[PDB]
Amino acid sequence: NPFQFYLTRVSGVKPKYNSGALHIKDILSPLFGTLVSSAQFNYCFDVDWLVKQYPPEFRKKPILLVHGDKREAKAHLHAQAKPYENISLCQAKLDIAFGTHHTKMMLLLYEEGLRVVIHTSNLIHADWHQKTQGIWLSPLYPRIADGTHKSGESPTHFKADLISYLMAYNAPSLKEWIDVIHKHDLSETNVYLIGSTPGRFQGSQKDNWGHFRLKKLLKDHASSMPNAESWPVVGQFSSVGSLGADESKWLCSEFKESMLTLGKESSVPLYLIYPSVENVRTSLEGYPAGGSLPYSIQTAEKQNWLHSYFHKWSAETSGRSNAMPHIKTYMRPSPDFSKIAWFLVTSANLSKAAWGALEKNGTQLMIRSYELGVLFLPSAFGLDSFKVKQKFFAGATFPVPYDLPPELYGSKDRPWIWNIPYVKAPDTHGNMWVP
Ligand SMILES: O=C(O)c1c[nH]c2c(S(=O)(=O)F)cccc2c1=O
Ligand SMILES: *S(=O)(=O)c1cccc2c(=O)c(C(=O)O)c[nH]c12
Numbered sequence: 001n002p003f004q005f006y007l008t009r010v011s012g013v014k015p016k017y018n019s020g021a022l023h024i025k026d027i028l029s030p031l032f033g034t035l036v037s038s039a040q041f042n043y044c045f046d047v048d049w050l051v052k053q054y055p056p057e058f059r060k061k062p063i064l065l066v067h068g069d070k071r072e073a074k075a076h077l078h079a080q081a082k083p084y085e086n087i088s089l090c091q092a093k094l095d096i097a098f099g100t101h102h103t104k105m106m107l108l109l110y111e112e113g114l115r116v117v118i119h120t121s122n123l124i125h126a127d128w129h130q131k132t133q134g135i136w137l138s139p140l141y142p143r144i145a146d147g148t149h150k151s152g153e154s155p156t157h158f159k160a161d162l163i164s165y166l167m168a169y170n171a172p173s174l175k176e177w178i179d180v181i182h183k184h185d186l187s188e189t190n191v192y193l194i195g196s197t198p199g200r201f202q203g204s205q206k207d208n209w210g211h212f213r214l215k216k217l218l219k220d221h222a223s224s225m226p227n228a229e230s231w232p233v234v235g236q237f238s239s240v241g242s243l244g245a246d247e248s249k250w251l252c253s254e255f256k257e258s259m260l261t262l263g264k265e266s267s268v269p270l271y272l273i274y275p276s277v278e279n280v281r282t283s284l285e286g287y288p289a290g291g292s293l294p295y296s297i298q299t300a301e302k303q304n305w306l307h308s309y310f311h312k313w314s315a316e317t318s319g320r321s322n323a324m325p326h327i328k329t330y331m332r333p334s335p336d337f338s339k340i341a342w343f344l345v346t347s348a349n350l351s352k353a354a355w356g357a358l359e360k361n362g363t364q365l366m367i368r369s370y371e372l373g374v375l376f377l378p379s380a381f382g383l384d385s386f387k388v389k390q391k392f393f394a395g396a397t398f399p400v401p402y403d404l405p406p407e408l409y410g411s412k413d414r415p416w417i418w419n420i421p422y423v424k425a426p427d428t429h430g431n432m433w434v435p
């Protein structure tokens, strides 16, 4: 398949729903390449678990862990890694308050070439067990031949853009990976990189990151159709940030404005998919899945206007309605949801920290965190749109992993709010939630 977009395997679904899914052990297997060194960009790590996911014959190859931890959190990560002489650590600089390193990426250097994996899962057992997570697998990139005079660049500019993303860390261990990427031919890449890095971006640099990056790509490489105002926007995420006192403060003024861009010329329905309390309670994990669905009561009660946009998690199409989402996706379906104009899988949740918030009279985009995703545009595949994969077939599509159209919350539903108790009905393991 051309998209190379995969879900993680889910323990408990019938085999039909895992056959085209990937476990971390599959990604790292010798069949994917003969590993010589890897970099693991992530947020949370279980180092003992992680090393066991590599094939035994590769467990002593160098591993770089790229993380954002500080102070005692950083001390705990170093303590986890110290038994493994081959593991080095790179602490991503986070010079803006409340910033985090959320990017999930593997750089896998092989004897045969290079592979890039951009995904949504932490490097801990629970994130690959019973959650809905997304994976983009790059091709095996070959080394550029000696005396060849190739850029190795793709029509999507992925090679330069990935190097640009790495340069933002200003890290010597990542300059080593930049030099590796320079040596490889990434020209087959058919996705666009969309990253966020911490900073305050002005002028030209405004288009490099966050939701302005998305807007620029949609302006440059998508075309606007008639009736485009009827094509909804869908956002699907596992955390909700503080968005302001009303939808005009950020959600519909700059976030939706970036996401509704199509083409270069100058009322759109907005669907937000986020697990309800009932979604979480009846999930495979039960209430403990809500430990990975951060939405504070303190934030929620200041933006009740938001919840009228909320739709339940439903994923019959991939057998994953009870596998809570830690994937984040954004897309532009047609009014009947049979086609999409583009699809994005990313780490970025529905938050200003991840996507950026305009400052200084609209002239500066401020981003707190590292985020990373990849954008699927029909034009990159010679197509005008993507047909949508669904559960029902009457009888070759983009594999949207959840059901369309999204289903509105019922009047008795509530968004999952992780730091209040739920003691009225037990979860699938027989337990309540008392935070
Ligand atoms: O964008 C995001 O998804 C998030 C960003 N920050 C968080 C923090 S914070 O202490 O770093 F402000 C604490 C808890 C959850 C989140 C979160 O979910
Ligand atoms: S390469 O095969 O070594 C090659 C072949 C033709 C021309 C050049 C060239 O002009 C340069 C340069 O630095 O300008 C390098 N390699 C070339």
Ligand SMILES: *S(=O)(=O)c1cccc2c(=O)c(C(=O)O)c[nH]c12
Pocket: 100, 102, 238, 239, 291, 292, 293, 294, 326, 347, 349
């Ligand atoms: S961290 O950014 O402070 C943090 C802490 C707990 C849980 C999460 C979380 O679930 C996510 C997510 O994308 O779901 C991100 N950061 C977290």
